[PDB]
Design a protein around this ligand. Structure first.
Ligand SMILES: CN(C)c1ncnc2nc[nH]c12
Ligand SMILES: [Cl-]
Length: 260
C-alpha cells in the first residue's frame, strides 16, 4: 500500500481529470482524511483552498510536494456525493431536497462572501459527511471575482453544460454570482425530478425553449410541486440581472416551508 509521510493511501474515492483522490489513514492516530494526488493553476487552487473555513465547504488541511507529485490534504466526506442520493426519474423526498438546498445556499453565501466563485456546482461536487451534511468540493475551477471590495467580471467559459447559465454561452463577460445561483437551480431540479431539464440553455435546445415558453406540463417540471417550482421560476431566469439573488431566495415561500 502506498504512503505519504505519516499517512497510508488505502483506496480511491474519486478518479477525475485533475488526478486521483485517496482515503489517507494516519497509521499511528487512525485519523482518516482525503488526499488529492496531482502529477505536476495549482498555485491558485491551493491559495483558494487555504481561504476556506465553513461547515458546508470542504476544509483544506495542507499540502506536500514529493518530486512531481503534489498531495492536497482535505476534509473527508464519508457519505459519498449528492449524485448517489438522487434516484433517476424520481429525485428524492422534498424535505431531504430542501435540507440539502439550505446547506448548499449556506456554502455558496460563504464562498460569495469571501469573493470566491466555484463555477462547477453539480451533484458530483456536493459531498456528504457521516451525518449527511453537504460539503461543496473541488476548487479546481474556482476563481476570485471580488478583491479589495471590487468585483471583476468573468470571461472564461467553464463548468458543465447542463448546469451552466445561458449568459456564459452568450456574453463576452458576465457576473460570477448569478452563474453559481443558476447551477444551484439545476441541482434543485435534479433533486426533485431525478432528471436534468436540458443539454444546455441555448436557443437551439428545444427543452430550454419549452421552459422559456412556460410549458411546465412537460417533464421534469410536472414532477415538481407548485411551491419549489415557483422558486425554480425565479432562479432559472435567462437575464442574469432579473434572476433572483440569494438574499431573495432566503425569503422564498418554499425555502421557508416547514417539511417532514
Ligand atoms: C470523491 N471525493 C473527491 C472525495 N470523497 C470524499 N471526501 C473528499 N474530500 C475531498 N474530496 C473528497
Ligand atoms: Cl440527475
Amino acid at each position: 500500500v502506498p504512503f505519504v509521510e505519516d499517512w497510508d493511501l488505502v483506496q480511491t474515492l474519486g478518479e477525475g481529470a485533475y488526478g486521483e483522490v485517496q482515503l489517507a489513514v494516519n497509521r499511528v492516530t487512525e485519523e482518516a482524511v482525503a488526499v488529492k494526488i496531482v502529477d505536476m493553476n495549482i498555485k491558485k487552487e491551493i491559495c483558494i483552498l487555504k481561504m476556506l473555513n465553513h461547515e458546508n465547504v470542504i476544509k483544506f488541511y495542507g499540502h506536500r510536494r514529493e518530486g512531481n507529485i503534489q498531495y492536497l490534504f482535505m476534509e473527508l466526506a464519508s457519505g459519498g456525493s449528492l449524485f448517489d442520493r438522487i434516484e433517476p426519474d424520481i429525485g428524492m423526498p422534498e424535505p431531504d431536497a430542501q435540507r440539502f438546498f439550505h446547506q448548499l445556499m449556506a456554502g455558496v453565501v460563504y464562498l460569495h462572501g469571501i469573493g470566491i466563485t466555484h463555477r462547477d456546482i453539480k451533484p458530483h461536487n456536493l459531498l456528504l459527511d457521516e451525518r449527511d451534511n453537504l460539503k461543496i468540493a473541488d476548487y479546481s475551477l474556482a476563481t476570485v471575482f471580488r478583491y479589495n471590495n471590487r468585483e471583476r467580471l468573468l470571461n472564461k467559459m467553464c463548468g458543465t453544460l447542463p448546469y451552466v447559465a445561458p449568459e456564459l454561452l452568450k456574453r463576452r463577460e458576465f457576473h460570477a454570482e448569478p452563474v453559481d445561483v443558476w447551477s444551484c437551480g439545476i441541482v434543485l431540479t435534479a433533486m426533485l425530478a431525478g432528471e436534468l431539464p436540458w443539454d444546455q440553455p441555448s436557443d437551439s435546445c428545444q427543452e430550454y425553449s419549452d421552459w422559456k415558453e412556460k410549458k411546465t406540463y412537460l417533464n421534469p417540471w410536472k414532477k415538481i410541486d407548485s411551491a419549489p417550482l415557483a422558486l425554480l421560476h425565479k432562479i432559472l431566469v435567462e437575464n442574469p440581472s432579473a434572476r433572483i439573488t440569494i438574499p431573495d431566495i432566503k425569503k422564498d415561500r418554499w425555502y421557508n416551508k416547514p417539511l417532514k
